[PDB]
Amino acid sequence: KVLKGLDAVRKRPGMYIGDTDDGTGLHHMVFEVVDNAIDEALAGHCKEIIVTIHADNSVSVQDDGRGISVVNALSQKLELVIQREGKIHRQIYEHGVPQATGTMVRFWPSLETFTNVTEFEYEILAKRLRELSFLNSGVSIRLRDKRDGKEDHFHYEGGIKAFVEYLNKNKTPIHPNIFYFSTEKDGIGVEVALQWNDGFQENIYCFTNNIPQRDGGTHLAGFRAAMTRTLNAYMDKEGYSKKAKVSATGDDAREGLIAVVSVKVPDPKFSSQTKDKLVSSEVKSAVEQQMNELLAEYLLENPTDAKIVVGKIIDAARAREAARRAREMTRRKGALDLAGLPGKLADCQERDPALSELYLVEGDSAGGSAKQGRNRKNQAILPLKGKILNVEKARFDKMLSSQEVATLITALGCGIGRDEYNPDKLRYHSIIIMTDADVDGSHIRTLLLTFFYRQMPEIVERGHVYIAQPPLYKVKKGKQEQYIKDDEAMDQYQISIALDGATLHTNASAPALAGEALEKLVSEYNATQKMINRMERRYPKAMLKELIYQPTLTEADLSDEQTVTRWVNALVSELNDKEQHGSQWKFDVHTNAEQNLFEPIVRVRTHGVDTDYPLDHEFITGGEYRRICTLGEKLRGLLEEDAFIERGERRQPVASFEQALDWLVKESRRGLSIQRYKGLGEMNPEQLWETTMDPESRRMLRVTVKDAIAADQLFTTLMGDAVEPRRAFIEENALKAANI
DNA sequence: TTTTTTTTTTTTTTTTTTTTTTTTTTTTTT
DNA sequence: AAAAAAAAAAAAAAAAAAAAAAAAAAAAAA
DSSP states (O other), rough: OHHHHHHHHHHHHHHHHHTTTTTTHHHHHHHHHHHHHHHHTSSSOOOEEEEOOOTTEEEEEEEOOSSOHHHHHHEEEEEEEEEEETEEEEEESSSBBBOOHHHHHHHHTTTTTOOOOOOOOOOHHHHHHHHHHHHSSTOEEEETTTTEEEEEEOSSSSHHHHHHHHHHSSSSSSSSEEEEOOOETTEEEEEEEEBTTOOOOOEEEEEEESSSTTBBBHHHHHOOOHHHHHHHHHHHHHHHHHHHOOOOOOSOOOOOOOOEEEOSSSSSOOOOTTSSSSSOOHHHHHHHHHHHHHHHHHHHHHHHHHHHHHHHHHHHHHHHHHHHHOOOOOOOOOEEEEEEOSSSOBSSSSOOOSSOOOEESHHHHHHHHHHSSOOOTEEEEEEESSOOOOOTTSSSOOOOOHHHHHHHHHOOOTTTTTSOGGGOOOOOOEEEEEESSSSSHHHHHHHHHHHHHHOHHOOOTTOEEEEOOSSSSEEEEEEEEEESSSOOOOOOOHHHHHHOOOEEESSSSSOOOOHHHHHHHHHHHHHHHHHHHTTTTTHHHHHHHHHHSSSSHHHHHHHHHHHHHHHHHHHHHHHHHOSSSSSEEEEEEEEEHHHHHHEEEEEETTTTTEEEEOOOOHHHSSHHHHHHHHHHHHSSSOOOOEEEEEOOSSEEEEEHHHHHHHHHHHHTTSOOEEEEEEETTTOOOHHHHHHOOOOSSSSEEEOSOHHOOOOOOOHHHHHHSSSSHHHHHHHHHHHHHHOO
């Protein structure tokens, strides 16, 4: 029982602990023990964790809590001495084989499993322990490197303030005070800290239950939104912006910012098993509210620092203003005066171009949805009418449509005629093509790009044209919510939910596989399945799927006639056993006298139609078979007889990776609910503001021309009158997609 | 100071138009 | 002869208007 699990862990140590070649497994074991010690300490029982690095390639972690397995299997020895109630009890585990106020565990890593990294780099351990000391306020950590004689004492009662001070010790902080708080509201404990510096670089560090988040997350978005809102409100109230004659925006307060954000959710939800991005919906609101209150309170309390921060922000805003191109003010449509603009236009209030935007939307319903949710000061909306003229196919004199005339009038380039064209009189220096997220939205985007590239080439060159990316799907699982752009992102999200909070055990008594390793296995499986589906015309799906689990057939096996017969006979017998349809599989071997190779053939009789699928020499080294062999080598022995999986409460014995994946997906899609938006008229205006109108949470794309000649050729082929180059291009791309 | 006709509800009855995309023909224009 | 331009077949994206039927307020003719 226990020995089976220990041997299972010992067979594939990289699956459980991580890649041992780079020494990451040893560091992972040390951090696991330190994490257990910190978990004991968080219950208010331990206060010192003396981590000693010995000279015999071993490390011991002391604990002072209440006190009294992957680590036992990989470790060749374990020294567990529990000092409880005035008693000392010693137990020694040797490869998980036992021989008979916390503990010191002096684990011995087995040199067989780990390769190329024996000794521990104490700088990495020191960095991680210092980070944990900052995160865990009032928790002493003692590093003791005995081999080199060095020692250290990481102990900071401030915590996040100490983290900010450590980050800013080498840099030049701009003001002495450090904003901080550790308020907790409805269980979402939030800790934030701030200190600007003269480096004009942004560095915001995010943590979630003492786990770093590389790619930000909901806490990062809430922090940024709260900071921008509070600083803008302070600027507007005190009137420093009017004296500066410039409006501060995002990426100016954030410029030259050092901050740390730490959260502790009871049930966190991440985008993947790497936990590099938090996607928990509830975390944003608490961070936003606490920042909105307390940062404003700090600004009121510290007017000396507020002046310096406002001065730096004004300097950044002045630099950004100076970087802009020369321009002039322009009349805007208003209640008193219309200035000869279209009725459908909903113009803004800011007369200055380069502080205004135009959203080109697909219709009147999307127009109303965007008009209800926007910023009236900056953003203007010009709703089109469905699909517009293809100016490439159409004549120049055919451009007398109300749709294109409305677009020409609002931009006021006067591009009609090719005589009054003047991009210097452009009314908006940010033209945004906010079409629907669906296929016809993409087509209308292409038509608008043709209009802008052909009729207004300098507007595209100067970078005024932008593309919005509104979401197509909204997915909800009770409290959780997300916005998804494409079906590929939908598939990735479905995989992430399937692997969310689930454990796979090779044996009945064995530990769970690592989340990263399981994600890599599932990614390999999905890639191979996609390749097999692409190969479905050439060969049957059943034979290709069965080739994964069979032994690999190398070129040396081809020369031996008996080996090929045994291999193909085993393959066909396995196919016949696992057959749920009327297909009848039979084997044959064809002998080439030229090359002395006995190639196999797998005859099939499906639906009464007999067919032969010879696996020639090309297929053995055809590239796809290499991928099949690699996945087979990965998946030979990841499922014993008593394998099972779990998703927390529920359990399921399994016998194949297909069964486990299907069960995981089926449990993923239990509470799921997808809302597909068939254009912006189906989104609420608040949803439009959150996703793709707010500059804080915007995701745009500048249209640029890398090559003029290649762009012209592509436009003429895809959008010209001649159909044959278009058909050839589409067929070539279809074949390219079908092939690797 | 007085008629008269015009706007607005909210349920009813009615219709109308503009583009994309590919073959194939028919005009018409040189 | 030759090129260019318009129309129509079928699925897609967009939208536009005319009147009844009461009350009650403007905003001009008289």
